[PDB]
């Protein structure tokens, strides 16, 4: 999952890069100013893997606000499908990591 | 503890960017302070880097993963002691503006050892 | 058109050797086949950017890096055009900067709303939407500053007296409004402007130009405007261009369009947009079709709108090159070919 997280990052940072170009300049401090809300977060959960209550977090998209992306051109929603994606994928991975840990 | 979006402290600008698109950040109104800190590679003193790192880490009582693509080494000498306690501070190495190459991971590293 | 090469024409001829500059397709397919950054920089290097990106080392070159490299020697020639003509012509290229200094305003809005930074952020400012106020209009404490520093000495005034009214911009989103509706303004002032003063034929294309790009702003807000719903129709009626060529017909559908069935019935009624949103990217569609017009402006010989069509052809061009060069760096060879540009 090393190399599988990195190939889904770099996927992830050409689609936003596309939506970029989509768009003119770039997302820069119009993406940043929409740090108010977070559409992607770790759920908490346990789930007891050979007896031992490991702390696996589990990623949930929130589904109440999207609007981070709702900006400039129509590619941004593909490139936050994209990188929600690739937020799920390195999630998965911190969650394989903490369970490696504990 | 109560759930939280990844931060980007130590990832690159792109890779910051790219959380932020996705929705990796909330704001915080009690100190005007939000959830992913800012990806000033290049920019930023080690000193601050490893400082936000700590309070990210540490400060933070959310259960934020962290991000540490292609950090340097202001963020690598504090990876040794900092995967300690990976709840509610997770720790990973996305990729970045440098290559993600296994060899500078924490983690790998100790996985590989382990063996 | 005889009275055009009184002033223009040293302008006319270096902007004809420029386009004499502009990439060809049998060059796009030889910059393709280049496997890595530097072999991409060792390549354009015999096309007209030439030695540009001798100045930078091959480990510190980034996608990003060529960008803003490329993008600065094309700005440098455009301030160079720019100053080097008056008159009708010299608020011709004005009004070409506009469009990048209303960007420019719009992201210098956001923090001031909130005031994290200055510096930084006034120096990430692209460097052709530049005005000789920004550096003042900057170091505004609040949005009342900026309102009053931005209706006295800078050519936001008009479009802000119109659209604004003492600085009611804290309950407005910055990108999806503020900008939107100023890029309008903007936008309704130029398409007046070569309505009046420029002659034939820069008018008629450049009219039907500025109506595409209206249409293609219009189109972009319609279809960014559904997914959420708090952009009541009213404001999104006046939010769209009100000037163009699918206006009124399509522009009042486009108004009341609710979903993606409303906008695809409403644009695919005009003849040159049928199945325009229908398959694929509309960046890909989009950037073809501005091509297209902008190859026809090159094809008149004598016409203002030959800058426009020059400097839009040579920002889709840097646009292509950032896409080679990023799709040949972060691998993904399978949409090289992605590139729009036909010359």
């Keep these: 999952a090393k190399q599988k997280m990195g190939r889904v990052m770099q996927t992830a940072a050409f689609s936003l890069a596309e939506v970029s170009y989509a768009t003119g300049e770039n997302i820069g401090y119009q993406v940043q100013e929409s740090v108010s809300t977070a559409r992607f977060k770790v759920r908490a959960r346990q789930e007891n893997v050979s007896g031992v209550y490991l702390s696996q977090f589990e990623s949930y998209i929130d589904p109440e606000i999207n609007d981070f992306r709702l900006t400039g051109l129509g590619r941004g929603g593909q490139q936050v499908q994209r990188a929600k994606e690739i937020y799920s994928r390195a999630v998965e991975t911190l969650v394989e990591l903490a369970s490696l840990q504990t | ?115 | 058109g005889v009275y055009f090469n009184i002033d223009n024409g040293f302008i006319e001829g270096v902007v004809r050797g420029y386009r004499n500059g502009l990439l060809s397709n049998n060059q796009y397919i030889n910059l393709t086949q280049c496997d890595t950054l530097e072999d991409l920089k060792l390549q354009l290097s015999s096309t007209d950017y030439g030695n540009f990106l001798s100045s930078v080392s091959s480990e510190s070159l980034t996608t990003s890096l060529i960008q803003e490299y490329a993008s600065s020697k094309l700005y440098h020639e455009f301030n160079y055009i720019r100053d080097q003509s008056s008159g009708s012509t010299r608020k011709f290229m004005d009004y070409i900067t506009y469009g990048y200094m209303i960007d420019n305003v719009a992201l210098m809005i956001t923090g001031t709303i909130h005031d994290r930074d200055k510096g930084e952020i006034l120096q990430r400012c692209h460097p052709l939407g530049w005005f000789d106020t920004l550096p003042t209009l900057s170091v505004a404490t609040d949005l009342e500053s900026l309102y009053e520093t931005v209706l006295v000495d800078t050519p936001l005034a008009p479009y802000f007296k119109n659209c604004f009214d003492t600085a009611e911009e804290l309950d407005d989103m910055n990108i999806e409004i503020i900008r939107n509706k100023l890029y309008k303004a903007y936008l309704e002032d130029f398409y007046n402007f070569v309505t009046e003063e420029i002659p034939e034929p820069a008018k008629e294309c450049m009219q039907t130009l500025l109506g595409f790009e209206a249409d293609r702003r219009s189109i972009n807000i319609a279809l960014n405007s559904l997914q959420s719903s708090d952009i009541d129709p009213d404001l999104k009626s006046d939010l769209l261009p009100n000037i163009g060529k699918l206006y009124p017909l399509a522009t009042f559908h486009l108004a009341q369009a609710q979903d993606f069935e409303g906008v695809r019935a409403a644009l695919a009624n005009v003849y040159e947009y049928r199945g325009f949103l229908e398959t694929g990217n509309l960046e890909d569609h989009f950037y073809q079709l501005e091509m297209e017009l902008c190859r026809d402006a090159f094809t008149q010989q004598f016409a203002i709108s030959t800058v426009w069509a020059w400097m839009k052809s040579k920002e889709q061009e840097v646009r292509n090159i950032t896409w080679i060069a990023e799709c040949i760096a972060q691998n993904q060879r399978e949409r090289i070919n992605n590139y729009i540009s036909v010359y």
Excluded: C, M, W
Excluded at chain 2, 20 to 38: D, H, R, S, Y
Excluded at chain 2, 42 to 47: A, D, R, S, V
Excluded at chain 2, 49 to 68: M, P, V, W, Y
């Design chain 2, 1 to 115: 503890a109560e759930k939280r979006t990844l931060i980007a402290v130590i990832a690159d600008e792109d890779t910051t960017t790219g959380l932020l698109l996705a929705g990796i950040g909330q704001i915080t109104p009690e100190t005007q302070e939000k959830n992913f800190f800012v990806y000033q590679e290049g920019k930023t003193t080690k000193e601050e880097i490893t400082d936000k790192f700590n309070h990210f880490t540490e400060e933070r009582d959310d259960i934020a993963i962290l991000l540490i693509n292609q950090h340097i080494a202001e963020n690598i000498r504090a990876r040794v002691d900092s995967f300690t306690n990976a709840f509610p501070a997770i720790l990973e190495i996305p990729s970045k503006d440098h290559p993600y190459d296994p060899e500078k991971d924490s983690v790998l590293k100790r996985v590989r050892k382990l063996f």
